Design a protein around this ligand. Structure first.
Ligand code: K
Ligand code: MG
Ligand code: MG
Ligand code: MG
Ligand code: MG
Ligand code: MG
Ligand code: MG
Ligand code: MG
Ligand code: MG
Ligand code: MG
Ligand code: MG
Ligand code: MG
Ligand code: MG
Ligand code: ZN
Lengths: 272, 198, 350, 40, 48, 57
RNA sequence: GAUGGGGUAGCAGAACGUUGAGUGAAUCUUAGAUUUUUUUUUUAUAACUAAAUAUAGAUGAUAACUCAAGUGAGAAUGGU
RNA sequence: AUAAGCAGCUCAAGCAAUAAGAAAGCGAGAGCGUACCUUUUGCAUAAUGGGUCACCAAGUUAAUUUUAGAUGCGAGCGAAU
RNA sequence: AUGUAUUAAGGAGAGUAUAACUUAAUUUAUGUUUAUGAUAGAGGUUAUCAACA
């Protein structure tokens, strides 16, 4: 039902689509049947999603055969170890969010992405509310959307109440880490969301202005639009990355006074 | 999107996202797991060499040998080997509607024809092209005389006769190779009435 | 199917057997190459080399498995190295001796000898696999060989409550490396530190088995040459197996035991005192004789390092690089045996 | 982006956000992202 | 006599007999493409 | 310009000492508790009190 | 126990690669043909091994020999 | 963040794989090295040309007249019946 | 590009069922063959479900 075909048809045709939608709502209507639909009306039945969630079952099936054979070639090997990338994906939550097309440039918005980098979402929103830049109001709206996606879609930031207990009910000693830049933090809630990564890209050309100079000269001025990507992670990623840097510093060994430096010239005689 | 959604369910495991609670895709404006009305009703016009291909197995676009009211069997897609009765017959795109509860699919309703309390997504009956369905008709076993259902793979018109004064015609459909004249399904004529302005 | 006929003709009851049949080893190109790679004599048939590659975890039957060959082989390897190590370094401390026996005939080096022979392991044991692959089951926890060591009555306490074990009972109670004795299926998993041990165990047992087959078919002298060529040819710096606690005290007990005059640390040379990286060379002198010398950055460390070098020189005393072995007598007529040096033992001090 | 009228899909993700944070509902992994035969 | 395929290599190692069980237990297709058919979403829209 | 400025010498000019400074002079508002700048009047309470004095008086 | 070894203008020999064509109604491909990548090896303007991603049964790719050229670009204040 | 590199080459410390095995890459430090093309007796030349990348972009065809090699026939050849 | 066949005045403005073309902008009739074609139904706007002459 297009927006320019809805008025090009007679009432009988239009009034025949409403009885279709009407009769579709009588079949959708306590708890076991009411949990198969989202508040937006998306029916969570397999037959209703198989055509969109599983459009190509002939290719998915073969791909799932490739991963099961690759998973048994590792369970047979006695020396296999879970890759670092496979072990983090199933332990640490992450959300990549790409903002909408902002009416600004990359050399302007790049400085607004380096300001919120590394900060927590709460710390980053307080800096967008009190910035003088016109694009800081757009970064505050796009950072609230990403946080909503993280909490709902990915489940992040949902452990506070549980973490507040150990700190106070048991007087536990929170974790003290140090970021890659060197800033010291004290994490009491490991589920707190923060801005791990962020980069700005350039989009399509908003428009074109003409610059009428002297001597009948004209120049084209491209109006830029740009986007920003935020990678939101929980504080468990920073507590893991700090323990790795600390372990790599205690693994290089201590400093010895007289080191055994190599002599890198080989000669077919003795010089001493 | 399905190539990337399956790699995440494999990797994330217990951290698999809840994509059904996500926002729409601004490229097309659809929700998760829902089609678009243009793609769920198959109302997009097709070329003339396509209509002849979709109807190749049942006559031709102007001598179609399938009518509404006759049971068909699906032979393509996820809902293969399904059997339902034809309700509508769109002769423009050569698409057919089967009012079976298994062919339903989520669709995103455009907000210009929807109230503000109405749910954005609804389940409507999806249509199929004519090529994706074959005719099912019960025939008699010549050896034992028992009636059983069979799938008709091809139909062709027979005994075509036109009426020039009325611009009408009446033909018969038969199964090539076996010459089994299949009767037409019970079609109710449109109700013609006398209006006050006539 | 018809398009892909099987590459190897096998009966239908072949994928269920624990290990390939004996007659299967007579048609595999991996065994024939493995037999010719180690220069094994033609006395050892291919049906015997195949049995060496079947671990007891893939086959529970005493025959068709490495259990018996790997035993007879471990006894020869251990005996030949024990006698060679005592003749070469007669004064090695007992703990270091265990570390050096384990450094040659242990699961770690024997795993590299099998990987240097081009021995590829089988994914999962079965009758279909070609006999040229080392086949074992790494998910079976209880697989182990029979050893001469006995189980300690206080084993549980030693692990749980950190009781003291000792280094004089290890010779009798423990195994030959000093360690204590007795210390469907889903393949959707990853490696384990326990499976890695089974992988090491399977390789070691195979290398031990090859020596057991050489002994059975070719005799004693053939086994000794194989051990002498493939195992004893490996190089180890025994000076790097030493860890000292209070060496200066131990060195004093040595001189006191041997009746040598008390040791005195003397500063042979030095430079850069009152600097970031000074060098002090101190020599420990028993009377006029110089026992050992060490150079370090700290004056105390230089005295400790000098005492270690003097102790290493005492323990690492070697009559010769290629000494005669008591096993050289039981073979064909050789020169009369000359008594070898027997050291009292390592000094026990505070 | 700050001026786009919030649609019906953006109003349902804000009601869920307040229901998860408050503690009414407990977040659980998605079950309809893809129809894999492994189910793990 | 014929080309050695990844299937032949796995049989030699012994891993294949385990793969047939896992693929069969998961209802996946051993040495085939199954009863599933070709992608028809674009073909149904009249794609050429 | 005689030559084209490289990626290095242009990145020095753009970001070396030109990082946006984080505003740290923020205090809460006594009447409502909302975050405001230091020594400044709350923008949400100003409008509300400014409108409260226009209705009744 | 053969002789010879820089090179502009210039002359000569021998090859590779690109596009299309014949043999070709041929060969190969879900037991993965093809994937602008990465990687490996081989006296190597080239091909090859493996890996990763996607999924094709031919309007797909292709050895070898041969045929014809709109056949090879850091350089024209060249052009888009 | 003590340094005067046509950013390559020769020498090379060190870092780099949670683990059996496996080091590509980056490289402190030492030395050598004044872009390319065109045009000229001769150009790092402060002589000409180029902001980068992709694509377009130049000894070809016809007739005619020769030569070499190969090959058919042979005091005939070619063409054509 | 060449060849074969046929033909021997071309354009624009505005309007109109947006495959349909001239304020009649989808005229009205004939003959034949219609699945063994040609190359015993439904359907006049829910239209033109028939091509050739
Ligand atoms: K050219
Ligand atoms: Mg002017
Ligand atoms: Mg009729
Ligand atoms: Mg020369
Ligand atoms: Mg030359
Ligand atoms: Mg590729
Ligand atoms: Mg140019
Ligand atoms: Mg410096
Ligand atoms: Mg001049
Ligand atoms: Mg200059
Ligand atoms: Mg110049
Ligand atoms: Mg210039
Ligand atoms: Mg060109
Ligand atoms: Zn206030």
């Amino acid at each position: 039902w297009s927006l320019f075909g809805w008025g090009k048809q007679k009432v009988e045709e239009r009034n025949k689509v409403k009885e279709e939608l009407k009769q579709s709502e009588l079949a959708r209507t306590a708890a076991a049947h009411a949990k198969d639909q989202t508040p937006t009306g998306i029916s969570l039945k397999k037959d209703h999603l198989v055509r969109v969630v599983d459009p190509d079952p002939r290719s998915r099936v073969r791909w799932e055969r490739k991963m099961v054979i690759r998973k048994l070639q590792r369970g047979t090997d006695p020396w296999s170890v879970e890759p670092k990338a496979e072990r983090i994906a199933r332990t640490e939550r992450k959300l990549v969010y790409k903002t909408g097309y902002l009416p600004t440039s990359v050399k302007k918005l790049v400085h607004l992405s380096r300001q919120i980098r590394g900060k927590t979402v709460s710390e980053a929103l307080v800096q967008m509310q009190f910035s003088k830049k016109k694009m800081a109001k757009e970064v505050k709206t796009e950072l609230l959307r990403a946080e909503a996606k993280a909490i709902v879609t990915r489940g992040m930031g949902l452990g506070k109440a549980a973490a507040a207990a150990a700190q106070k009910e048991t007087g536990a000693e929170p974790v003290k880490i140090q970021t890659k830049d060197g800033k010291h933090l004290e994490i009491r809630d490991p589920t707190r969301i923060y801005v791990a990564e962020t980069f700005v890209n350039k989009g399509f050309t908003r428009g074109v202005e003409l610059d009428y100079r002297a001597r009948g000269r004209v120049f084209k001025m491209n109006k830029p639009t740009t986007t920003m990507t935020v990678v939101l992670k929980e504080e468990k990623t920073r507590i893991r990355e700090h323990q790795e840097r600390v372990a790599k510093k205690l693994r290089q060994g201590p400093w010895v006074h007289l080191p055994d430096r190599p002599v890198t010239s080989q000669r077919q005689f003795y010089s001493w | 999107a399905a190539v990337e959604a399956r790699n995440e369910d494999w990797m994330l495991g217990p951290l698999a996202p809840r994509r059904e609670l996500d926002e729409i895709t601004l490229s097309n404006g659809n929700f998760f797991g829902s089609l678009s009305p243009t793609r769920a009703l198959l109302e997009s016009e097709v070329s003339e060499e396509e209509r002849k291909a979709r109807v190749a197995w049942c006559g031709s676009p102007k001598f179609l040998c399938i009518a509404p009211g006759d049971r068909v069997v699906v032979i393509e897609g996820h809902h293969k080997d399904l059997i339902g009765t034809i309700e509508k017959l769109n002769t423009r795109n050569m698409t057919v509607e089967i009012q079976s509860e298994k062919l339903k699919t989520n669709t995103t309703v455009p907000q210009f024809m929807q109230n503000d309390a109405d749910k954005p997504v609804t389940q409507i009956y999806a249509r199929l092209p004519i090529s994706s369905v074959r005719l099912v008709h019960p025939l008699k076993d010549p050896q034992t005389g028992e009636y059983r259902d069979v799938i008709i793979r091809e139909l062709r018109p027979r005994n075509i006769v036109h009426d020039r004064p009325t611009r009408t015609r009446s033909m018969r459909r038969f199964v090539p190779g076996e010459n089994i004249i299949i009767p037409w399904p019970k079609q109710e004529p449109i109700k013609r009435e006398d209006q006050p302005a006539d | 199917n018809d398009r892909f006929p099987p590459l190897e003709p096998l009966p239908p009851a072949a994928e269920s057997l624990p290990s390939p049949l004996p007659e299967r080893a007579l048609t595999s190109a991996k065994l024939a190459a493995l037999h010719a790679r180690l220069n094994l004599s033609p006395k050892i048939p291919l049906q015997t080399l195949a049995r060496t590659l079947v671990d007891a975890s893939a086959d529970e039957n005493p025959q068709f498995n490495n259990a018996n060959l790997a035993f007879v082989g471990q006894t020869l390897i251990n005996y030949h190295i024990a006698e060679w190590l005592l003749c070469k370094y007669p004064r090695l401390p007992q703990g270091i001796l265990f570390s050096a026996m384990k450094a040659y005939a242990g699961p770690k080096p024997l795993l590299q000898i099998a990987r240097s022979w081009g021995v590829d392991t089988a994914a999962v044991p079965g009758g279909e696999v070609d006999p040229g692959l080392l086949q074992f089951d790494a998910l079976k926890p209880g697989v182990a060989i029979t050893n001469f060591g006995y189980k300690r009555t206080e084993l549980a306490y030693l692990e749980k409550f950190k009781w003291r074990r000792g280094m004089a009972s290890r010779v009798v109670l423990d195994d030959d490396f000093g360690d204590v004795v007795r210390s469907d299926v889903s393949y959707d998993r990853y490696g384990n530190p326990d499976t890695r041990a089974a992988a090491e165990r399977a390789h070691a047992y195979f290398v031990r088995a090859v020596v057991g087959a050489i002994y059975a078919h070719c005799g004693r002298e053939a086994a000794k040459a194989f051990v002498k060529a493939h195992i004893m040819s490996r190089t180890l710096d025994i000076a790097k197996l030493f860890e000292f606690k209070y060496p200066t005290r131990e060195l004093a007990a040595l001189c006191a035991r041997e009746d040598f005059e008390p040791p005195v640390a003397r500063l042979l040379s030095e430079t850069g005192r009152q600097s970031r990286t000074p060098v002090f060379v101190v020599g420990i002198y028993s009377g006029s004789d110089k026992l050992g010398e060490g150079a370090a950055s700290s004056l105390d460390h230089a005295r400790f390092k000098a005492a270690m070098n003097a102790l290493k020189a005492w323990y690492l005393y070697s009559p010769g690089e290629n000494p005669r072995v008591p096993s050289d007598m039981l073979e064909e007529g050789a020169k009369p045996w000359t008594p070898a040096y027997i050291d009292m033992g390592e000094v026990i001090s505070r | 982006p700050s001026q786009f009228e919030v649609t019906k899909d953006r109003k349902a993700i804000k009601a869920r956000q307040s229901k998860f944070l408050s503690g009414e509902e407990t977040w659980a992994p998605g079950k309809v992202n893809a129809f894999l035969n492994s189910k793990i | 006599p014929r080309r050695v395929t990844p299937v032949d290599k796995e049989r030699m190692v012994g891993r294949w007999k385990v793969i047939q069980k896992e693929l069969q237990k998961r209802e996946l297709p051993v040495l085939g493409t199954g009863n599933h058919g070709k992608y028809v979403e674009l073909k149904w829209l009249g794609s050429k | 310009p005689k030559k084209k400025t490289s990626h290095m010498k242009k990145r020095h000019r753009q970001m070396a000492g030109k990082a946006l400074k984080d505003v740290t002079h923020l205090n809460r508002c006594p009447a409502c508790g909302n975050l405001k700048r230091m020594h400044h009047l709350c923008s949400t309470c100003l409008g509300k009190l400014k409108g409260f004095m226009d209705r009744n008086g």
